[PDB]
Amino acid sequence: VINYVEKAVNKLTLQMPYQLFIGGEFVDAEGSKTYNTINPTDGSVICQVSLAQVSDVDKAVAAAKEAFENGLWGKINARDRGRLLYRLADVMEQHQEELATIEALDAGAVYTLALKTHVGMSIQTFRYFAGWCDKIQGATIPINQARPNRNLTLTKKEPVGVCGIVIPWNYPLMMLSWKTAACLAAGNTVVIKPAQVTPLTALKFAELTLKAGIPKGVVNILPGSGSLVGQRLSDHPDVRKIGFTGSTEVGKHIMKSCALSNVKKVSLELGGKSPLIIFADCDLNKAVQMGMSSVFFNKGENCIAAGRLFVEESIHNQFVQKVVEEVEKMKIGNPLERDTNHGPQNHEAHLRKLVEYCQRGVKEGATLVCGGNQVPRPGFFFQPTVFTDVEDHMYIAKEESFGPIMIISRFADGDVDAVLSRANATEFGLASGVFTRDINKALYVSDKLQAGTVFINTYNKTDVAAPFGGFKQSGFGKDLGEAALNEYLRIKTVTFEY
Amino acid sequence: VINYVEKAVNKLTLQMPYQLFIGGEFVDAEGSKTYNTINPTDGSVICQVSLAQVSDVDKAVAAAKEAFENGLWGKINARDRGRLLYRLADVMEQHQEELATIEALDAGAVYTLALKTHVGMSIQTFRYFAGWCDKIQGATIPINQARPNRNLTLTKKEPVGVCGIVIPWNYPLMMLSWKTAACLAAGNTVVIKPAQVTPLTALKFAELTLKAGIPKGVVNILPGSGSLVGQRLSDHPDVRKIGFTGSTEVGKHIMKSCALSNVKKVSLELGGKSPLIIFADCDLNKAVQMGMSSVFFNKGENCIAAGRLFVEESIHNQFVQKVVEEVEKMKIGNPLERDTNHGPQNHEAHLRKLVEYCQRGVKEGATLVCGGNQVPRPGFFFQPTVFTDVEDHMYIAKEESFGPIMIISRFADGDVDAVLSRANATEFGLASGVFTRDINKALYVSDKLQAGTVFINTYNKTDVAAPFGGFKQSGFGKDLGEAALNEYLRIKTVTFEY
Amino acid sequence: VINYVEKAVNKLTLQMPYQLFIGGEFVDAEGSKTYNTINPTDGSVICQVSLAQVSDVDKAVAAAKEAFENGLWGKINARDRGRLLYRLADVMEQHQEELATIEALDAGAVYTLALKTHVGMSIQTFRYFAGWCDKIQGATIPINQARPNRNLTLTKKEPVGVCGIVIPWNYPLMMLSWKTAACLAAGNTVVIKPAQVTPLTALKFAELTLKAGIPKGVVNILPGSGSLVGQRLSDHPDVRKIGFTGSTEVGKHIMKSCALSNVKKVSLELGGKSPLIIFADCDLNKAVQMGMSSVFFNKGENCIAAGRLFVEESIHNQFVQKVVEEVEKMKIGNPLERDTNHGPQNHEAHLRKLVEYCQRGVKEGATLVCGGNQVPRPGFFFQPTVFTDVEDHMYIAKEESFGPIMIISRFADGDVDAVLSRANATEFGLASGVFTRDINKALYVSDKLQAGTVFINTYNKTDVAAPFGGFKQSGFGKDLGEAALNEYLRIKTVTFEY
Amino acid sequence: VINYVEKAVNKLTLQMPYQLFIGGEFVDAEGSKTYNTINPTDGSVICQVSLAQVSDVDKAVAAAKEAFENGLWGKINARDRGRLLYRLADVMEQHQEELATIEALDAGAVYTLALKTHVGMSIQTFRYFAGWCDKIQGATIPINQARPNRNLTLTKKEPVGVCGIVIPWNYPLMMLSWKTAACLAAGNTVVIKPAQVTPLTALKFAELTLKAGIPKGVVNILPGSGSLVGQRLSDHPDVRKIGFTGSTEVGKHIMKSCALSNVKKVSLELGGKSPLIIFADCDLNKAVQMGMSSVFFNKGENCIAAGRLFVEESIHNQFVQKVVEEVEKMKIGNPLERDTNHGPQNHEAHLRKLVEYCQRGVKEGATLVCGGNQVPRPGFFFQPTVFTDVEDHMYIAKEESFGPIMIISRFADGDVDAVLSRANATEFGLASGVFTRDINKALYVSDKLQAGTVFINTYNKTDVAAPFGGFKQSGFGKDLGEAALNEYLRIKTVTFEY
Ligand SMILES: NC(=O)c1ccc[n+]([C@@H]2O[C@H](COP(=O)([O-])OP(=O)(O)OC[C@H]3O[C@@H](n4cnc5c(N)ncnc54)[C@H](OP(=O)(O)O)[C@@H]3O)[C@@H](O)[C@H]2O)c1
Ligand SMILES: [Mg+2]
Ligand SMILES: [Mg+2]
Ligand SMILES: [Mg+2]
Numbered sequence A, B, C, D: 001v002i003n004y005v006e007k008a009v010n011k012l013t014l015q016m017p018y019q020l021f022i023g024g025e026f027v028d029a030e031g032s033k034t035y036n037t038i039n040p041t042d043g044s045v046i047c048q049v050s051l052a053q054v055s056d057v058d059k060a061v062a063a064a065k066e067a068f069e070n071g072l073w074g075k076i077n078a079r080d081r082g083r084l085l086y087r088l089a090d091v092m093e094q095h096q097e098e099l100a101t102i103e104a105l106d107a108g109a110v111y112t113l114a115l116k117t118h119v120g121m122s123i124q125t126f127r128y129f130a131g132w133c134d135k136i137q138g139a140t141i142p143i144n145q146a147r148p149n150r151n152l153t154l155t156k157k158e159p160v161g162v163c164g165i166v167i168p169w170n171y172p173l174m175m176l177s178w179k180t181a182a183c184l185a186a187g188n189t190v191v192i193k194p195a196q197v198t199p200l201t202a203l204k205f206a207e208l209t210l211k212a213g214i215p216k217g218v219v220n221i222l223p224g225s226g227s228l229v230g231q232r233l234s235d236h237p238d239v240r241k242i243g244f245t246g247s248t249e250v251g252k253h254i255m256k257s258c259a260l261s262n263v264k265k266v267s268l269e270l271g272g273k274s275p276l277i278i279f280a281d282c283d284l285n286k287a288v289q290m291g292m293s294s295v296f297f298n299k300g301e302n303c304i305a306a307g308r309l310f311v312e313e314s315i316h317n318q319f320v321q322k323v324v325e326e327v328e329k330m331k332i333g334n335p336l337e338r339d340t341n342h343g344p345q346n347h348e349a350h351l352r353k354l355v356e357y358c359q360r361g362v363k364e365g366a367t368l369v370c371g372g373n374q375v376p377r378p379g380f381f382f383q384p385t386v387f388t389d390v391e392d393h394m395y396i397a398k399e400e401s402f403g404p405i406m407i408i409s410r411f412a413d414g415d416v417d418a419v420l421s422r423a424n425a426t427e428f429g430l431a432s433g434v435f436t437r438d439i440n441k442a443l444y445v446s447d448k449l450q451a452g453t454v455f456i457n458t459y460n461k462t463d464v465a466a467p468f469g470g471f472k473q474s475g476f477g478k479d480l481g482e483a484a485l486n487e488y489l490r491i492k493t494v495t496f497e498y
């Protein structure tokens, strides 16, 4: 029997595990330490959650090591590993409403969005990677022959072993799923550290791995702090790979920690200040819709959000007028209400950061067209915000807000290389976008943009088959697509003489 | 007109550049600083070589950055980049006897071996990778369609940009060539730091890039210290990738330095303590030949050298007797003499380490069968060495010698998993081997060995098409083969809606 | 509602469709023509089955064309096409006992074997290929640039369109499933012609496509004759690809018909006379078990069956003794008896061919060790048979029996190239095997065998991920594995200038 | 010493072999039979060329068989095969002016174009495929394990063996090189049948294989008739693959012949009636230039030539006006004259077809704007032709001219699907094109076009890395790119149990 926090909400009964998940069981942390997880809609405590300690990290890593080396997971056919992962996706689908409701409570995710995206894309992720298991293939290579003898050279793709996954709070289940599905499909075992502020869907997911028959110790989940739990994962001698999504500063520290312990492999999905270039020859009404989505999607808590919009001079004023008209129509409210389309920010400290961010924007001379303030209601709601007259030297032109803040600059009619230079003048390089009907401009701009993803006449169009990752200080390595698997596999070269 | 150190040796007149190579020209280091490079055959000074300073690193990086961003290398077709690399290989082949002679002088490489391997394989590497240029391909991906609209998702493989390559002294030209060929084939530009003790073939290679018509600034070479030049490369804000081969401890420091600066990509080819398991059902005389090669090849200065031989009890004594017979036939001498089998160690400090290494092996109780000492003659020669009765707890069972020291342990007749456990009981995982006529043992053993390469009934059989790289604390990423290209490329995802 | 033949058998009430399946409906053939399908266990008529006419082929092709061009199948996401194929596999699994019972009745497949192989592998096939749908990818290619302009070249993998699949009677559901799964995974629509003698699992499968929600007209099934129905498929102007499995001579005729009509694509999986080479250094008792399986599996009605065993002189007589001992332990009987090892042959004409085949072998001078005739009992049972003293010029050394007839020749101790020559002296090239503990022999022999599949120390080890196809007059193209997809896809090159 | 036809022309002394090339030597045909090859500039006999007989085909195939099975080509490293192919390309480059002059004489190729395309692209082809030799790789596949035992499955890519290549006359050396480069890169040996009317560059190429060190019997060349020499190649029991480029009707017969003999593999590059759709929003002057090229390149003797131009109503009249202006600037003359940009048609019988073609176009009611006739001068020159008011039912809207005949239809402004239907209403599907500045229209039209190549805002942009082949009755299989290799390789699956 598992201990649950039970809650009647959104026409169902939530049964939320709140403990550490280690070696297939829910257990208290060392000293039965706990912390509170906070509902961003009203600021209330949802429940107490176990607070993992160093010795809990060591127990989780040991369980994952044992599951990998001696348990069933390291012994079953790749095809049968695939079947378990497909069954896990099915179990997630069976609990889709519950998962989306937990995400709404824990992260402020608008329920209809959480169903489609946070949860829906997570289900797709597991199904996609389940199909890879028995399709991961090595090679045979026509090497020079040691005549008069013969040689055969092949490669074997093998799992890396025990992995640690450390993730942020913006899409709790979805970030977990992106990384965990690739990690498990490759035959690894894993210890996951969800963001401290958003533990709940990760813990429910953990229970779902039991319903799906994932062998004990294959998945271990440790709610707790990055400075304690995430640090120990990066330091651990039995951990062989870290997959990390989060800020550039923490990413630097993770990579350093991997080096200093045992040169464990690392992948980094870091910040972004992604440019969206909107040309005068675009479909303007569609540009408004997609440009708004590029910023405001999931209350701006979106790693690939456009952190900068460059709008061609001749359409700039009309674009801004139309954005303001649409912003006024947005319904801000409880994420569980079906008419809501703008939920609360994830947690209080982040709301504070956004308020301060917009103060700095105003202070430095940018024009606040709308928003900029907390919404006067319970919880941590922030107004969808538009800045214009943004100049390249400005703080808000350089720093990632991670909030619903549209940051608009003009560029001269007929400029292309000049706007590209400005769009590329960042140490980030996660995503980017261009709206234009001109094929030649679209293709040229996509070539020249220094970003891991370039959207053309769309935005936020991720897909489980399409690799996602940054350039420059946005990191390296891919989540999603075949490419993601390479972070979780090692290649053994075997060379025979006969 | 280039300044050379001219030397008449080996029936040739060598013309050796000795300066820094920056932006297509040989130039003195800042303050005209120099150091001596030492011939290991007699301990003499070959010549003075420029000693690169931090400002020289900055100049090299600036030249590499300009060559990539604005120079011809970044504008030519992939096919034509390929042609230039194939021309470079032809120029290397035209200069092959000279390059091999320089390597004999600088590294103590036996001339006949240097022709075939140090230089021969370097030529193969550039020809192999030249072939990849116009065969590096991205993907088109069947993503979910945003109905009633359509989507197209493709990926583009792009160069990473400015790279730094840092290499060791055991195969100076060959290590340079492995990493440099892959780096340039992927469209990058490069700053290379050869090991301070072995700069000469790198600098002659620099001149050959001019003869081949490689655009100025594409290749820059900086003889000098790792703690100055290599460090600045790892720290530099304009360098986007480091490719490193060397020790595990320096690798840790490089990875840390990559993290703390700009999260530049890193790949690491580190040390090894590679096991070779010899079963009683092997071809014994072949096992003796290949077993000796596994240790003694290139005077043991060989990152994949077998650092432990486990020999089945019933053949152990006969194997050792046969090895001693063959060891006594090895001809030690000047690398330029055609009858030489065993050249001098690379430099004096390494010879000293080898002497100390074998003192400790004797102290801790292993049986010294032969060698263990500096050869009484000028230069830095070391006697091919055989230890037996080696136990798992011993220093020489754990530490990489990087010299011609065969380190033998027994295992009980029939004891497959037990010997595997002992072979895998290391934090290294670079290479490994198994000698057996039994197909079932060979396949099982190669599955169970925790190493990036497994040789079966052979050893030292590398090939430019076969990826080479370690597991665990031997690092990550591959040199050679298609897989090497992935360290030098980035993937851009481009997603259209229409 | 669908009309069924109902049969209370094997603890089940079978519900067997017996009509043509066209455009998602079970329909009578033109003029309500029918034929009898015969139970090989007792020679009884199972039921009457619709006999497709030319006008029925035209209707099926028209339904497939409409389904491809205008129906849902041509519009849904690849991922969602995958979901439907997964669901079809689940539906087949839910009906697995019924399908295996139908196969026992219709083909004489031993029920326990039919569950595991005929049906179980069919389920694996659909699940495997379902995973490929959204992982079928094209390329982006670094072509030469039309300077001062730019070029982008990509490829798109597209379905071929309407396909015809023509199959034999030995594994009715499995052969259908192999080809159909790959065909549908690639986005095509299909008209299937099962062998006239074995229509029933194909028709039950058709019904299962309805339960799975496969759109109308995507799958059409036409029981009837090859010379009428199969011919019209190969001739049809709207069919773009034929996938064929059967005899070399029909294959030739099919390929000719494809040529003369509209040069539709063709793949051919034809006969075999597959050699199994058994060396004296093999594990003898395992060689007997696997050697017997290589011949007797599925009553020898197995395209990859070993049609000759070459057994090394020193073990030949012991091998034959052990085979005879084991043959005598085989239980012959009703496919539904749970201890049956050897079921009846598929139909009466095939039994008669096997009697004649063995008369011919004795006449021409081979030694009949055991078997060679019909088992006296109702139905069409043939004795497991062993021939020795088989010489290379003999009819039975050249002709495929497609029955449970082990055909043994000696080869000389210590010869390898000579036995290889004999094993390769056939115009077939489908499969082959080698039993030896010697790694060098195993690898050399696998290089030298002229056959699409080589088994090493096993036999009949097919796998849905491992491509299966012949060389020489065994045909071309693969079933199973990623390679199977290529027969069902076309490549469009799209080249932009911008 | 080789017998040459010597010719002082184009400031060169041509040395042209004229005999069969068999087993590394130039030899007379059976009975010393010969035929005349005709210069299309003036109708004169260039020289007599050996006329291959059936016994000569058998000698060629025997030489290819021996070279493959026992000669050096079947024994060397893939890497060294690559080196030989690279060397071949270098030799071709050393003879480029001579090859281009021979092609001008034999095929009427304008010298400047023959240098850049006929010859230049052939050189690129051999270099490109030389790079593939040691990069052709098989797989290791994670199959289900026969527990308690283990399984390893790998694939080996092997050569198909002796190949026959049959090619047309429009780009004699280039069509030879496309197919031969891929064939040889895959490790095969070859018998080549050039078009009877254009034997000379093939025979010179044969001599260049000697200069390059290609082993005897690897390349064999048989000038002669399709109905005799080509037929015997397709029939031969020792030929295992035919690569064919030519008409759909000869393709059908070749494929039938492959079927009826030994089911040899076949690829077919057949005719085309390729549509070019020109939208009103295109760059009109560039559309004229590229539209001109699409039709008139290489005097229309171009398999991918646009066979119909569909021009949007609102720009149609202006397009035609601009085309006529450009047509009038074309200089018709001797291909060796530097100012010539329109050479003669290849041979007399082709000229006669073009004359009849345009008579029929006029008869059926199309508007003949200009040309349509043989130019009054010696040789076989044809006036660049423009037809307008072409309706879909007309012969010239359906049938491939293969001459310099622009065939223009209108479509209504704003129609997209309607013009696509018309463009796709053909049994051909080789190439196609769209000109438009609208990204959405370009991507949609490229999806919907039923052709193996789609050009966007360009035409005739082939590349050695970009696969080229037809759909429907334009055949199957690719020349060029990685995909071409698949026609010349077979896959062997090797499955171990251990
Ligand atoms: N898809 C492509 O890549 C491509 C490229 C270029 C051209 N083509 C097509 O080629 C056609 C123009 O050439 P064409 O009309 O001269 O071609 P064709 O009549 O089909 O001849 C092509 C080749 O086939 C040979 N041939 C004739 N009968 C044969 C037989 N029974 N068995 C074996 N070979 C036989 C011919 O020999 P002879 O010398 O005796 O005629 C010639 O060498 C056009 O339709 C064009 O589109 C296609
Ligand atoms: Mg934070
Ligand atoms: Mg050192
Ligand atoms: Mg039959």
Ligand SMILES: [Mg+2]
Pocket (backbone or CB within 6 Å): D247
């Ligand atoms: Mg013709």
